[PDB]
């Protein structure tokens, strides 16, 4: 099947007798769930994103069911604002990004062109918006706040900015601020005709 990116790519996942809505997240290395008391050994781990780090528990070898597919791997548990299916499990169920085909064993980093500049950015189905590391862009910007795994940040919102992504042209909203990596979000992914497929 093919999942478009017009809205958040949410799917039901099953873990034991517990069913959860979770975000299919190409911008996450790891799979991170809210509230649950899985059996067995775990270790503490710190995971980071847009507004800092959170502490989680790492459970290994946990079988999940995603979209009728059987997966088994590491599941992190902690105070994530949304449940997140990461690349560790996305690869096992055969999920790719497609327009050419990008598999998810590595971070889906591509080269983008913005204002004559070449930068590396992450194709992120788990991002509503496109957020770039601090840079100068032209035009009147609007102050804005956004959130991620570790909380909220101030960003600057530029509208109708041209961005060439893997040679595909988009023109849309680009937020600039203290993101850990450049992030191409769904607003631009839809513009270049990207989908999740499995």
């Amino acid at each position: 099947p093919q999942i478009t990116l017009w809205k958040r790519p949410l799917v039901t996942i099953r873990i034991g007798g517990q069913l959860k809505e979770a975000l299919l997240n190409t911008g996450a290395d790891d799979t991170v769930l809210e509230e649950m008391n899985l059996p067995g050994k775990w270790k503490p781990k710190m995971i980071g994103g847009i507004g800092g780090f959170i502490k989680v528990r790492q459970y290994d070898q946990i079988p999940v069911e995603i979209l009728g597919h059987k997966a088994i791997g590491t599941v992190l548990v902690g105070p994530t604002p949304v449940n997140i299916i990461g690349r560790n499990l996305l690869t096992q169920i055969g999920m790719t990004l497609n327009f050419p085909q990008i598999t998810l064993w590595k971070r889906p980093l591509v080269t983008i062109r913005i204002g004559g500049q070449l930068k590396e950015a992450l194709l992120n189905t788990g991002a509503d918006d496109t957020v770039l590391e601090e840079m100068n862009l032209p035009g009147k910007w609007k102050p804005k706040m956004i959130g991620g795994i570790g909380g909220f940040i101030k960003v600057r919102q530029y509208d109708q900015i041209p961005v060439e992504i893997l040679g595909h042209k988009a023109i849309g909203t680009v937020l600039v601020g203290p993101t850990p990596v450049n992030i191409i979000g769904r607003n631009l992914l839809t513009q270049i005709g990207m989908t999740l497929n499995f």
Binding site: L23, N25, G27, A28, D29, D30, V32, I47, G48, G49, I50, F53, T80, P81, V82, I84, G86, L122, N124, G126, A127, D128, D129, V131, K144, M145, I146, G147, G148, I149, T179, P180, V181, I183, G185
Partner: peptide, 7 residues
């Protein structure tokens, strides 16, 4: 307005 991505 939410941007997950976990390191």
């Amino acid at each position: 307005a939410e941007t997950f991505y976990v390191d």
